[PDB]
């Protein structure tokens, strides 16, 4: 056995796995519970594991937060473009007989580019399957910009320039969402290489370890030859390699956190650091867990969770009420007047409450009490039907107290007396009596009005009451008084009911006014740790339409103090008064007064324990059950009889507090009552109230200590916490992202304005929101609902809020202010980074100029000379608006086109076209202009803002013409799609070469070639072509000597060599030892 949790192990050699849960490093479970009084351990596994060998299931669709990563955390690799091999002076290092080949940290090629392959070199236990992968710039990558809403276009190999911003935002969302991993503490290894003498190095789990050193350690190779790589290596420091420092909290012989030097990138290291901080700040203690459980058990059960002291333990289960309430609002909106959604919850809670409750109902009590062998003593017994054993209505009514604001429980229409009714008929009187005892248990905001008006209806023709108008007579069915705006003045003020005219009805109104049950409240839950999902109420109370009392089973059964028994006695005495003098039963040929009074007394006094159960024990069971429910209670205050404070409507608002927009009431306000109405059969409720007994040996301590254990060993609160954390994160990310593409009033700072886009409408915003939602769902690996109800009805929202209104126009707006979200913050950071290094993702800022450049010079089109380009300030240019009207020229006259100022100009000079002009009519233009661009003088600048690009390297010593590519692009730019702009760039050469003419047409306006890593990496220098050394500023901590190892210039330029923090936590399952209270 184990001397920590008193658990019995069959094989003593397997005790190590058990004590690993308690936290002892001796030498798949989610919850492990132990019972003190009995030998029956209960364990949990996820819903999809195996043959389920005597194990419970966790039915929550939990997300996966804790995910590890054993590998370098870079996201930008370095790829060659045009490979080239050169002669070398030094071939390999030699040590005695053996020799070792030289390995280079960078690809030895003529040119090199930096692309984005997130997690390209990463060993992960659980991949989120999201990826932003860029092909080398020679190949085209348009599938990543035609992702979201290019469902139908006019060209398959194109992307819509009007909708680049949404695609770029979703790409950034994927890039930040698939880098949410925690680094791990894989083992190290020394190194006595004459270049890294004595420095520790990290080894990766896999086939080879020496393979991954030239990568992640550029300084292991020395300076054997004279090349650009060797020159870069010779400038770095020789002490910032490998391990930096470790911890004193040694685990065995291996530390539990470490700082190392290796290749990485600042964006991903900062993203993972923020994720680490968010996960760490959610930590909770086993002592907190045991306190929560022991104070949630309402004192009937005490728990304990022994553990060993260890800092390196993480378990995120701590949230805030702000995050707890947003998911509650989302779940409230999920229903949308769908009874199919709410039926299973109520049915299952009814079944569970029936299974737990000690009260068992046997209708034989009524039959025994009314010892009969038509008579009133037999009509009532034939009407209550004491043979049917289906009493689900009572338990459903009990379960409906937790969802006042969602669902309203009312008495079914059939239960009321037929066609009005008359006090004249015995059958009718009994229907009224049955309805009167079952009405108070309903959640209908106006029960007493129906209770008074049913007797008022039955009593018509014998006695009368005044009315307010000649539209509503006394004979009005009580089923129509379902709204507080119809309460009669006679009911609200007794003095207008004259005792001379209506004595019995005045007494009925008096009894309703005084002895109607009044509401109360009870504490529950653990606000310290579990939070509170209750709205419109203080965060630690359940509201009940019944005054609760301390629970003891020795109370007298005919205690005329509890409201239910007092109500039964009052109703029976009123019926006695009604039937006493036979002023309302003409035609009764017998004197049934004696039998009626006997039956009424025999039913007034009875040994039914149901009122005592409802008064004392039922609130305890409700408070125990409530915190563990999948749907936390959503409750609206009960007002006993105050017509002033009767709630009528509950709605959810999407727009902000200070906005004047379309009034869009939520679908929850369309209900006539405060919630979705359901009907109950009053006969079952009356039978349940009149018949009920405790077991002949009830020890409540034992009963509840035994009952709570199975329902607490199978809990899902610890998973709903991650669920609503993810829900809040998704809500904030959605609102920010939709606000950056629509002109909502949310105050986010915008960084992607230069990328062309359009005013997103309701449909476009809904599609973008759907894509964001499904991307988040895929990344966090869940299949249930989240953020989906927000998709319906114009999801151009600002903040979530819920409110309800009283009868007198008074409202109560609940706006849970929410904290920051790491996902949105990291999205903002990566947007900042993209704003400066857009060129790494294949996006070129600026615009292009089309014109003939026939020269033998060698420069990149991305970096052009100044004199070739022109802007709006250049003299002689012609800016064109939309209204460009091409006019032919007859009799040898040159054709003319319309300037924005109204003047006409020939097809010659320097022009400035918006992209929309060519996109609108791309077929008329290239027919008229292509002849004047190939062998003419026309030069056009097409302002585009942001555009994808692909490169075509050509040998600079041979003739080359780009007219074919330019014409292909011009003919392929149809409306609603543009192919990537084709560029023709020369190839760098380390040796002097000859020169050949080259005709170029497409040149960028501004600098776009900042993704070029180096040219001729394995040569002493570059003579002909674009020159570019190794970027020093990116390897700042190696070159700059007086730089602390932590500082990073992240907003300006990413630096791909940093210090990363690696560590290995462990997550033990929730363990608890349940003990019974004497």
């Amino acid at each position: 056995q184990c001397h920590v949790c008193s658990a019995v192990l069959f094989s003593p050699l397997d005790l190590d796995a058990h004590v690993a849960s308690h936290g002892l490093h001796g030498n798949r479970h989610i919850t492990e519970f132990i019972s003190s009084w009995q030998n029956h351990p209960i364990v949990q596994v996820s819903a999809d594991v195996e043959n389920r060998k005597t194990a419970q299931l966790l039915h929550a669709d939990t997300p996966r937060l804790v995910t590890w990563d054993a590998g370098l955390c870079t996201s930008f690799k370095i790829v060659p473009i045009v490979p080239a091999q050169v002669p070398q002076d030094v071939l390999a290092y030699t040590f005695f007989t053996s020799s070792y080949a030289i390995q280079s940290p960078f690809p030895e090629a003529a040119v090199s580019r930096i692309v984005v392959h997130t997690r390209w070199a990463s060993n992960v236990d659980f991949d989120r399957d999201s990826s932003v992968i860029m092909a080398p710039p020679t190949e085209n990558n348009i599938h990543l910009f035609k992702q979201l809403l290019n469902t139908e276009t006019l060209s398959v190999r194109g992307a819509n320039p009007l909708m680049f911003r949404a695609n770029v935002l979703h790409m950034l969302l994927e890039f930040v969402l698939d880098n949410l991993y925690l680094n791990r503490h894989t083992g190290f290894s020394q190194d006595h290489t004459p270049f890294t003498e004595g420095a520790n190095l990290r080894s990766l789990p896999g086939p080879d370890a020496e393979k991954w050193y030239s990568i992640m350690y550029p300084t292991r190779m020395g300076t054997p030859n004279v090349s650009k790589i060797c020159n870069f290596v010779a400038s770095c420091v020789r002490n910032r390699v490998g391990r930096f420092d470790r911890a004193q909290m040694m685990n065995g012989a291996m530390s539990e956190w470490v700082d190392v030097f290796e290749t990485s990138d600042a964006l991903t290291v900062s993203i993972r650091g923020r994720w680490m901080a968010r996960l760490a700040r959610m930590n909770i203690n086993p002592t907190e867990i045991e306190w929560a459980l022991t104070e949630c058990a309402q004192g009937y059960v005490t728990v304990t969770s022994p553990y060993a002291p260890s800092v390196n333990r993480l378990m995120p289960y701590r949230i805030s009420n702000a995050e707890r309430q947003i998911s509650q609002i989302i779940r409230v909106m999920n229903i949308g007047n769908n009874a199919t959604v709410i039926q299973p919850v109520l049915q299952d809670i009814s079944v569970l409450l029936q299974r737990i409750s000690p009260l068992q109902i046997d209708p034989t009590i009524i039959s025994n009490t009314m010892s009969t062998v038509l008579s009133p003593a037999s009509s009532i017994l034939g009407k209550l039907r004491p043979s049917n054993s289906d009493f689900s209505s009572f338990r459903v009514a009990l379960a409906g107290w937790l969802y006042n604001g969602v669902v309203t429980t009312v008495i079914d229409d059939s239960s009321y007396p037929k066609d009005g009714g008359s006090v004249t008929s015995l059958e009718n009187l009994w229907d009224f009596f049955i309805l009167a005892l079952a009405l108070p248990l309903t959640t209908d905001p106006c029960a007493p009005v129906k209770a008074f008006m049913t007797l008022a209806n039955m009593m018509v023709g014998f006695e009368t009451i005044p009315m307010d108008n000649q539209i509503y007579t006394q004979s009005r069915r009580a089923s129509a008084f379902s709204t507080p705006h119809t309460w009669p003045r006679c009911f609200m003020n007794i003095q207008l009911i004259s005792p001379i005219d209506a004595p019995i009805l005045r007494q009925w109104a008096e009894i309703i006014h005084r002895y109607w049950p009044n509401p109360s409240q009870i504490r529950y839950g653990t606000p310290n740790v579990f939070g509170s999902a209750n709205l419109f109420t203080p965060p630690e109370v359940l509201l009940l339409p019944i005054d609760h009392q301390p629970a003891n089973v020795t109370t007298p059964t005919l205690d005329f103090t509890n409201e239910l028994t007092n109500w039964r006695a009052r109703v029976c005495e009123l019926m006695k008064n009604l039937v006493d003098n036979q002023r309302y039963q003409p035609g009764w040929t017998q004197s049934l007064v004696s039998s009626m009074r006997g039956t009424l007394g025999k039913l007034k006094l009875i040994k039914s324990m149901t009122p005592m159960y409802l008064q004392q024990l039922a609130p305890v069971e409700l408070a125990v059950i409530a915190p563990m429910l999948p749907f936390p209670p959503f409750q609206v205050p009960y007002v006993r009889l105050d017509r002033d404070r009767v709630p009528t409507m509950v709605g959810v608002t999407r727009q902000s507090r200070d906005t004047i927009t379309q009034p869009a009431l939520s679908l929850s306000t369309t209900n006539t009552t405060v919630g979705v109405p359901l009907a109950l059969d009053a006969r079952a409720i009356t039978v349940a109230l009149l018949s009920g007994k405790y077991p002949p040996d009830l020890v409540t301590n034992v009963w509840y200590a035994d009952a709570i254990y199975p329902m607490y060993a199978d809990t899902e609160v610890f998973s709903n916490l991650q669920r609503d954390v993810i829900t809040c994160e998704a809500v904030q990310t959605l609102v920010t992202l939709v606000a950056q593409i629509s002109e909502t009033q949310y105050p986010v700072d915008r960084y992607l304005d230069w990328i062309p886009s359009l005013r997103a409408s309701a449909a476009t915003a809904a599609t973008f929101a759907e894509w964001v939602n499904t991307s988040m769902k895929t990344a966090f690996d869940l299949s249930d609902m989240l953020l989906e109800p927000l998709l319906s009805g114009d999801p151009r929202m600002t903040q979530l809020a819920i409110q309800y209104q009283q009868y007198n126009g008074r409202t109560f707006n609940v706006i849970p202010e929410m904290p920051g979200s790491v996902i949105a913050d990291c999205v903002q950071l990566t947007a900042e980074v993209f704003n400066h290094e857009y060129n790494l993702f294949g996006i070129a800022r600026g615009d292009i100029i089309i014109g003939r450049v026939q020269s033998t010079h060698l420069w990149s089109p991305l970096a052009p000379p100044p004199d070739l380009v022109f802007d709006r300030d250049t003299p002689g240019v012609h800016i064109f608006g939309r209204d460009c009207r091409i006019s032919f020229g007859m009799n040898g006259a040159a054709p003319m086109i319309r300037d924005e100022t109204g003047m006409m100009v020939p097809f010659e000079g320097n022009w400035i076209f918006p992209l929309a002009l060519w996109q609108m009519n791309t077929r008329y233009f290239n027919q008229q202009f292509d002849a004047w661009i190939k062998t003419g003088e026309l030069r056009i600048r097409i302002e585009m803002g942001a555009y994808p690009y692909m490169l075509h390297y050509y040998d600079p010593r041979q003739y080359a013409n780009a007219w074919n590519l330019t014409s292909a692009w011009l003919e392929e730019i149809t409306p609603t799609s543009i192919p990537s702009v084709p560029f023709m760039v020369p190839i760098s050469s380390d040796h002097d070469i000859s020169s050949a003419p080259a005709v170029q047409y497409i040149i960028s306006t501004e600098y776009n070639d900042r993704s070029l890593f180096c040219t001729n990496s394995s040569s002493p220098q570059t003579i002909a072509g674009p020159d570019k050394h190794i970027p020093v500023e990116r390897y700042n901590i190696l070159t700059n000597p007086d730089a602390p190892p932590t500082q990073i210039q992240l907003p300006e330029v990413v630096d791909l060599y940093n210090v990363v923090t690696r560590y290995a936590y462990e997550t033990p399952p929730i363990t608890a030892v349940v003990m019974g209270v004497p």
């Binding site: 009995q38 999920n334 959604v341 689900s392 679908l667 009907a679 329902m711 690996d781 319906s792």
Partner: protein, 140 residues
């Protein structure tokens, strides 16, 4: 150790101590088994209501039916499901024919779009038909 993925993603010397005993002696009154079965029934999470939300291409998901008609139909379906769960031919608790005039109830369906317009022609076809008018072809 690789944790398998739940849903498809984008790509797709020694002596026995005198106290220990291995024989049960107590049978719980509220049965362990009975409670567990009900609990796992209550433990089943909320049902997703995906009606009305847009799809990947933008077409709203659902069936073309009037809003109040859909609400009444699903209320009837809920009543039938309640009867089936109660395993009786007639259900005591009914979410339908309540007796409260609820003729203004609305429940989401596929009839309406996010732009407040009918879905007689699915949206993708509407956008395709709009763009078509603009297209021009190579000169004869």
């Amino acid at each position: 150790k690789r944790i398998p993925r739940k849903t498809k993603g984008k790509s797709s010397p020694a002596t026995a101590e005198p106290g220990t005993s291995n024989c049960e002696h107590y049978k719980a009154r509220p049965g362990i088994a009975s409670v567990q079965k009900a609990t796992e029934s209550a433990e089943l999470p909320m049902k997703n209501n995906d009606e009305g939300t847009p799809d990947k291409r933008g077409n709203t998901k659902g069936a073309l039916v009037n809003e109040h008609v859909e609400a009444r139909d699903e209320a009837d379906d809920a009543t039938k499901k309640q009867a089936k769960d109660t395993e009786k031919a007639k259900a005591q608790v009914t979410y339908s024919d309540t007796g409260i005039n609820n003729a203004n109830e609305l429940s989401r369906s596929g009839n309406v779009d996010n732009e407040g317009g009918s879905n007689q022609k699915p949206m993708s076809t509407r956008i395709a038909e709009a763009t078509s008018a603009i297209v021009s072809k190579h000169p004869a």
